[PDB]
Scaffold this active site. Structure first.
Site, PDB file in Angstrom:
ATOM      1  N   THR A  96      -4.031   1.024  -2.358  1.00  0.00           N
ATOM      2  CA  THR A  96      -3.659  -0.398  -1.833  1.00  0.00           C
ATOM      3  C   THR A  96      -3.879  -1.445  -3.223  1.00  0.00           C
ATOM      4  OG1 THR A  96      -4.618   0.015   0.454  1.00  0.00           O
ATOM      5  CG2 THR A  96      -4.378  -2.403  -0.267  1.00  0.00           C
ATOM      6  N   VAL A  97      -2.711  -2.288  -2.976  1.00  0.00           N
ATOM      7  CA  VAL A  97      -2.557  -3.077  -3.956  1.00  0.00           C
ATOM      8  C   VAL A  97      -2.899  -4.709  -3.470  1.00  0.00           C
ATOM      9  CG1 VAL A  97      -0.748  -4.497  -5.496  1.00  0.00           C
ATOM     10  CG2 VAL A  97      -0.981  -1.852  -5.375  1.00  0.00           C
ATOM     11  N   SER A 123      -0.390   4.599  -4.720  1.00  0.00           N
ATOM     12  CA  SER A 123      -1.651   5.416  -5.234  1.00  0.00           C
ATOM     13  C   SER A 123      -2.963   4.822  -4.625  1.00  0.00           C
ATOM     14  CB  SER A 123      -1.708   5.443  -6.744  1.00  0.00           C
ATOM     15  OG  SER A 123      -2.774   6.669  -7.170  1.00  0.00           O
ATOM     16  N   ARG A 154       0.829  -1.220   0.129  1.00  0.00           N
ATOM     17  CA  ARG A 154      -0.052   0.013  -0.024  1.00  0.00           C
ATOM     18  C   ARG A 154       0.776   1.367   0.006  1.00  0.00           C
ATOM     19  N   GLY A 155       0.235   2.390  -0.534  1.00  0.00           N
ATOM     20  CA  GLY A 155       0.906   3.648  -0.438  1.00  0.00           C
ATOM     21  C   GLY A 155       1.221   4.266  -1.761  1.00  0.00           C
ATOM     22  N   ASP A 174       8.334  10.103 -11.401  1.00  0.00           N
ATOM     23  CA  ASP A 174       8.356   9.548 -10.071  1.00  0.00           C
ATOM     24  C   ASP A 174       9.001   8.199  -9.928  1.00  0.00           C
ATOM     25  OD1 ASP A 174       7.653   9.730  -7.232  1.00  0.00           O
ATOM     26  OD2 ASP A 174       5.835   8.945  -7.435  1.00  0.00           O
TER      27      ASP A 174
HETATM   28  N1  LIG Z   1       3.541  -7.097  -6.541  1.00  0.00           N
HETATM   29  C1  LIG Z   1       2.619  -6.780  -7.892  1.00  0.00           C
HETATM   30  O1  LIG Z   1       2.302  -7.277  -8.837  1.00  0.00           O
HETATM   31  C2  LIG Z   1       2.322  -5.152  -7.769  1.00  0.00           C
HETATM   32  C3  LIG Z   1       2.665  -3.880  -6.854  1.00  0.00           C
HETATM   33  N2  LIG Z   1       2.205  -2.913  -7.551  1.00  0.00           N
HETATM   34  N3  LIG Z   1       1.617  -3.320  -8.476  1.00  0.00           N
HETATM   35  C4  LIG Z   1       0.739  -2.352  -9.260  1.00  0.00           C
HETATM   36  C5  LIG Z   1      -0.481  -2.638  -9.619  1.00  0.00           C
HETATM   37  C6  LIG Z   1      -1.375  -1.613 -10.491  1.00  0.00           C
HETATM   38  C7  LIG Z   1      -0.657  -0.209 -10.427  1.00  0.00           C
HETATM   39  C8  LIG Z   1       0.622  -0.117 -10.123  1.00  0.00           C
HETATM   40  C9  LIG Z   1       1.246  -1.095  -9.416  1.00  0.00           C
HETATM   41  C10 LIG Z   1       1.506  -4.404  -8.931  1.00  0.00           C
HETATM   42  N4  LIG Z   1       1.142  -5.061  -9.847  1.00  0.00           N
END
Ligand SMILES: NC(=O)c1cnn(-c2ccccc2)c1N
Ligand SMILES: NC(=O)c1cnn(-c2ccccc2)c1N
Ligand SMILES: [Ca+2]
Lengths: 276, 274
Positions: free
Chosen positions: B27-28, B25, B22-23, B137
């Site tokens: 939560t992932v 943009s 997370r953080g 960025d």
């Molecule tokens: N670990 C991952 O697969 C990951 C981490 N951030 N993102 C992400 C997803 C959407 C937009 C930007 C980053 C992933 N795919």
């Protein structure tokens, strides 16, 4: 929904254009992007054939579908620019036995799993996209032997080999693909050319219509093959004489998922190193 | 006139939606697509035009498809849920690889150079779109690593300060500055300005021409092509934007370096990792 355009690559931007395989496929490098690319090209004005494949590749974007990088559309030259697959085709892996004495089981199963993942994805598009020309020749392998499905020329929403074509399509169907897959699965687990004995291609066609299939026995498919029974079950139900007795790719995936989990992560990496 | 549309993913198709990071943009979370049978990653935050931000990133990821850019699989837009569905990166970020030293005791040189080359290839592609799309960025947290430790860049074209060029406090040349810092981080496995407590002390030091330390402690004499890399680093983070190379120039410098590594040495560097 949101829209994305396929870039137009000037011909002059492609450097070190060398012959790769016979339209014709050439390797090259993009002068600005600084990456290697592959270019499929012919020239007739009935060149909508090229534009149609390009459009299909562009719309069928997925993890296991050959990524298209751009269209090279000029009065002088017409071609499809895709990522370069440094390890060629699954056909060359299975049959150049001197170069590849061993092709470890985990890799064979990952390839099969991935072929199925690409085709399933196509089938789940809206509307469904059918490949209709699956063959070991069209299963391209990247740097780490991951699958990229190519050749969408005969795919719908003079030729070559017949061994992957279902008998019902001999006099020209959501069930064509699985039959092809089944034959591929068989060829992958055996490293045997289907209907090896039969030299006459028309003779093969006769046999196939009379219910015949490539030989499933100890000699072609040894007992040490991981999950031999479950795989043979899959191969047989896939290449059924009756189209309605054939499973979906979604069904095959569900079957394959626990089979793939029985191999440790490192064995894939081990299999690739052995080939390099 | 060839055009491709981004698929719409129904929330109910995203099974096993567990938290990941997370953080960024938002939560992932990791999940699996019920029909496609593949692991995925989902980025989710409902505010007024915060929705327009999620759609802006999705449009960018979809327009900027390339070998070294995180592939977007589809948008999940519903009255109930909003998220960007991308491929899943099982090896996380470059940051984790470089700094989790107990988990990763050895990150062999061939892999480091390949990561550097790919980051550059990714950014270069962006700079070559029409119009030029700027990252702005770039950081070790944004450089993602797939199953074979190949780079996928993310979180670009949307705008920690250790990667920010001094002129940006109050520009086609921003990204190369970040790249220079990243290169220094990759080659040293040290955190830039290690002994600095306050981010403001950094910002001030940076603006006075100070840069991460270059000596035998940070960049040991046994680094392949050390002299050569130091030059690239120093021209890349130069105080004067004009003196910084384009990504094209930077790629032409790197290409001969990457040719010196045998294709097998990358695979052997990867198998050695956890
Ligand atoms: N670990 C991952 O697969 C990951 C981490 N951030 N993102 C992400 C997803 C959407 C937009 C930007 C980053 C992933 N795919
Ligand atoms: N070896 C390769 O990279 C290769 C061979 N054929 N194709 C291909 C190119 C365009 C359309 C279909 C296949 C490749 N990319
Ligand atoms: Ca060999």
């Amino acid at each position: 929904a949101i829209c994305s355009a396929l870039p137009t690559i000037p011909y002059h931007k492609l450097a070190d254009l060398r012959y790769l395989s016979r339209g014709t496929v050439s390797s090259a490098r993009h002068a600005d992007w600084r990456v290697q690319v592959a270019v499929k090209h012919l020239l007739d004005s009935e060149r909508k054939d090229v534009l149609r494949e390009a459009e299909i590749l562009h719309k069928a974007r997925f993890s296991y579908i050959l990524p298209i990088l751009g269209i090279c559309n000029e009065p002088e030259f017409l071609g499809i620019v895709t990522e370069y697959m440094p390890n060629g085709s699954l056909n060359e892996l299975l049959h150049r036995k001197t170069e590849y004495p061993d092709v470890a089981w985990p890799l064979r199963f990952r390839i099969l799993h991935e072929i199925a993942l690409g085709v399933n994805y196509l089938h789940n598009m809206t509307p469904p996209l059918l490949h209709h020309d699956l063959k070991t020749q069209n299963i391209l392998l990247d740097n780490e032997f991951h699958v990229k499905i190519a050749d969408f020329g005969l795919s719908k929403w003079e030729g070559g080999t017949i061994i992957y074509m279902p008998p019902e399509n001999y006099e020209p169907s959501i069930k064509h693909d699985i039959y092809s897959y089944a034959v591929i699965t068989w060829e992958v687990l055996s490293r045997k050319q289907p209907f090896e004995d039969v030299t006459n291609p028309l003779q093969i066609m006769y046999s196939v219509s009379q219910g015949h299939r490539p030989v499933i026995n100890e000699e072609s498919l040894p007992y040490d093959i991981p999950h031999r029974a479950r795989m043979i079950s899959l191969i047989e139900s896939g290449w059924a004489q009756n189209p309605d007795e054939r499973p979906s790719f979604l069904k095959c995936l569900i079957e394959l998922e626990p089979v793939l989990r029985t191999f440790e992560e490192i064995t894939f990496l081990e299999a690739v190193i052995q080939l390099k």
